[PDB]
């Protein structure tokens, strides 16, 4: 059931902002590793004396990388005279975030009908404010509320090209990389206590419970917007098991709650994974260890109706996981952590089914692959 209870009009995921030590090196690594083009910038060369911000795009997916300059460059500025293109930015907030958590997501940004209305309604409904609505060049409105840990949910609305004050990137630096990634499918938080986290976020958004489930290290539940195109899963650890909760490991190395993974939809996951895997050892991203051959023998009996033997064999080459609910099928694979700490990682996904356009969450989030990987692993020992 979908009660469609959004307290304001939400459209789609808009962008994800990483807070970095050096935005240049992170953005260049991500561009090559994921196949995203350099599409906009805001930095010293655009008149920004406050922060360096670089935007990568692939299809509709937008990754923003931001780092602070020396505060001395902007010492005479005040907020009414700022050269920052993102008015919520603060040197001290950014250095404290990064010192505490390391490289990770500061902002999960969604496009809404009216960011000022979304902000007021959210705070009137219990959201902790982080940055009030600010109108940029009377064209774009931006506002932020706390989501979990030091992650903010950022609202963006357009009257009628990323943000005012950003410049489109010079074609020579804009190499048109593309490995098939097209949009953000979901963004997942890790918290110490799921119940309060769910109550808080669902409280101020009106997002409804899309899915939920309770030996594998975690309990999880998913919040969704009215058309279930904005999907926000949240996990908590389950203490008292054998192998340690990876959620608990996350919370320890991250210094508390934060964003666990970004799932990126590919229009051709086979091509995406071939391209990403070619680059793993030359600057790109590494993938989690592949499942044993038993996992792929067992796939025939699970998705032989959806995937040819041929296509299953291609999953096995690439290490791709498959899961299925009563409506759709999910192809998924997970990177190793994106940076130094065992905290944030990326998931690549493609969904098959639920055609009407495709409905969001088609096939679920892969919770069946915990048990099926475990079984697959034991069968291969013997």
Ligand X SMILES: Cc1c(C(=O)C2=C(O)CCCC2=O)ccc2c1C(=O)N(CCF)CC(=O)N2C
- Site for ligand X, rule CB under 6 A: 186, 188, 220, 233, 235, 246, 261, 263, 288, 321, 334, 345, 347, 365-367, 369-370, 373
| From candidates 67, 262, 307, 331, binder to a copy of itself by CB under 8 A | 67
Taking CB under 8 A as the binding criterion, the range among 144-152, 192-200, 280-288, 313-321 that sits at the site for a copy of itself is 280-288
We find the least distance from the C-beta atom of residue 161 to a copy of itself, in angstroms, to be 21
Binding to a copy of itself in span 102-121, by CB under 8 A: 102-103
Taking CB under 8 A as the binding criterion, the range among 118-126, 209-217, 283-291, 316-324 that sits at the site for a copy of itself is 283-291
What does the alpha-carbon distance between residue 167 and residue 378 come to, in Å, rounded to a whole number?
54
Question: Residue of minimal CB distance from Co ion?
Answer: 263
What does the alpha-carbon distance between residue 373 and residue 308 come to, in Å, rounded to a whole number?
21
Sequence-ordered list of residues with C-beta below 8 angstroms from that of 363, at least 6 positions apart, any chain: 323, 324, 325, 327, 328, 329, 330, 351, 352, 353, 354
With respect to a copy of itself, which residue has the nearer C-beta, 103 or 263?
A: 103
We find the least distance from the C-beta atom of residue 103 to ligand X, in angstroms, to be 17
> Could you say which of ligand X, a copy of itself, Co ion, none residue 117 binds, taking C-beta under 5 to 8 angstroms by partner kind?
none
> Could you say which of a copy of itself, ligand X, Co ion, none residue 370 binds, taking C-beta under 5 to 8 angstroms by partner kind?
ligand X
> Could you say which of ligand X, Co ion, a copy of itself, none residue 69 binds, taking C-beta under 5 to 8 angstroms by partner kind?
a copy of itself
Sequence-ordered list of residues with C-beta below 8 angstroms from that of 305, at least 6 positions apart, any chain: none
Tokens at 77, concatenated:
């500025």
> Could you say which of Co ion, ligand X, a copy of itself, none residue 246 binds, taking C-beta under 5 to 8 angstroms by partner kind?
ligand X
Q: What is the pattern of x (binds a copy of itself, CB under 8 A) and - over residues 331-370? A: -------xxxxx----------------------------
> Could you say which of a copy of itself, Co ion, ligand X, none residue 354 binds, taking C-beta under 5 to 8 angstroms by partner kind?
none
With respect to Co ion, which residue has the nearer C-beta, 114 or 185?
A: 185
With respect to Co ion, which residue has the nearer C-beta, 142 or 231?
A: 231
One-character DSSP codes across 139-177: TEEEEEEEEETTEEEEEEEE----STT-EEPPTTT----
Tokens at 288, concatenated:
């989690």
DSSP H helical ranges for the chain: 23-34, 91-101, 115-124, 194-205, 246-254, 269-278, 293-303, 309-318, 368-381
Angle at 148 between CA 373 and CA 265, to 5 degrees: 45
| From candidates 282, 326, 381, 382, binder to a copy of itself by CB under 8 A | 282
Taking CB under 8 A as the binding criterion, the range among 38-46, 182-190, 227-235, 366-374 that sits at the site for a copy of itself is 38-46
Residue 15 assigned ligand-binding role? no
Q: How many helices, marked H, and strands, marked E, lie in the chain?
A: 9, 17
Strand partners, 67: 52
Residue 51 assigned ligand-binding role? no
Residue 255 contacts a copy of itself per CB under 8 A: yes
Number of neighbouring beta carbons within 10 Å of residue 354: 16
One-character DSSP codes across 195-212: HHHHHHHHHHH--EEEEE
With respect to ligand X, which residue has the nearer C-beta, 140 or 264?
A: 264
Residue 2 contacts a copy of itself per CB under 8 A: no
Pairing of the two strands 167-168 and 37-42: antiparallel
Q: Which residue, 364, 382, 374, is CA-closest to 295?
A: 374
Residue 69 contacts a copy of itself per CB under 8 A: yes
DSSP H helical ranges for 35-189: 91-101, 115-124
Sequence-ordered list of residues with C-beta below 8 angstroms from that of 196, at least 6 positions apart, any chain: none
| From candidates 23, 107, 312, 318, binder to a copy of itself by CB under 8 A | 23
What does the alpha-carbon distance between residue 164 and residue 139 come to, in Å, rounded to a whole number?
8
Say how many residues make up the chain: 382
> Could you say which of Co ion, a copy of itself, ligand X, none residue 373 binds, taking C-beta under 5 to 8 angstroms by partner kind?
ligand X
Sequence-ordered list of residues with C-beta below 8 angstroms from that of 291, at least 6 positions apart, any chain: 319, 321, 373, 376, 377
Residue 347 assigned ligand-binding role? yes
Taking CB under 8 A as the binding criterion, the range among 167-175, 208-216, 236-244, 350-358 that sits at the site for a copy of itself is 167-175
Positions at the binding site for Fe cation: 186, 261, 347
Binding-site annotation: residue ranges: 186, 261, 347
């Amino acid at each position: 059931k979908n009660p469609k209870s959004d307290k304001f009009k939400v459209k789609r995921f808009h962008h994800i902002e990483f807070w970095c030590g050096d935005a240049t090196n992170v953005a260049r690594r991500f561009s090559w590793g994921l196949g995203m083009r350099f599409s906009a910038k805001s930095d010293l060369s655009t008149g920004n004396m406050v922060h360096a911000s670089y935007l990568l795009t692939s299809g509709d997916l937008r990754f923003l990388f931001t780092a602070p300059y020396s505060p001395s460059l902007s010492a005479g500025e005040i907020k009414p005279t700022t050269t920052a293109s993102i008015p919520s930015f603060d040197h001290g907030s950014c250095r404290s975030f990064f010192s505490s958590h390391g490289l990770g997501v500061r902002a999960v940004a969604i496009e809404v009908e009216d960011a000022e209305s979304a902000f007021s309604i959210s705070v009137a409904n219990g959201a902790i404010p982080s940055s009030p609505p600010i109108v940029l060049n009377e064209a774009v409105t931006i506002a932020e509320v706390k989501l979990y840990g030091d992650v903010v949910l950022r609202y963006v609305s357009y009257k009628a090209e990323f943000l005012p004050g950003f410049e489109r990137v010079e074609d020579a630096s804009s190499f048109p990389l593309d490995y098939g990634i097209r949009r953000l499918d979901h963004a997942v938080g890790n918290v110490p206590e799921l119940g309060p986290a769910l109550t808080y976020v669902a409280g101020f958004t009106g997002f409804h419970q899309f899915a939920e489930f309770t030996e594998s290290g975690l309990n999880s539940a998913v919040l969704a917007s009215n058309d279930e195109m904005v999907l926000l899963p949240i996990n908590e650890p389950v203490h008292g098991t054998k192998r340690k909760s990876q959620i608990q490991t996350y919370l320890e190395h991250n210094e508390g709650a934060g964003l666990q993974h970004l799932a990126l939809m590919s229009e051709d996951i086979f091509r995406t994974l071939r391209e990403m895997r070619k680059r793993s050892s030359i600057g790109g991203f590494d993938f989690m260890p592949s499942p044993p051959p038993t996992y792929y023998q067992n796939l025939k009996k699970r998705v032989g109706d959806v995937l040819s033997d041929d296509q299953i064999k291609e999953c096995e080459e690439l290490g791709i996981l498959v899961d299925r609910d009563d409506q759709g099928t999910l192809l998924q694979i997970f990177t190793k952590p994106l940076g130094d700490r065992p905290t944030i990682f990326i998931e690549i996904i493609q969904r098959v089914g639920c055609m009407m356009y495709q409905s969001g969450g088609c096939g679920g989030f892969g919770k069946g692959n915990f048990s099926e990987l475990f079984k697959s692993i034991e069968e291969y020992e013997k």
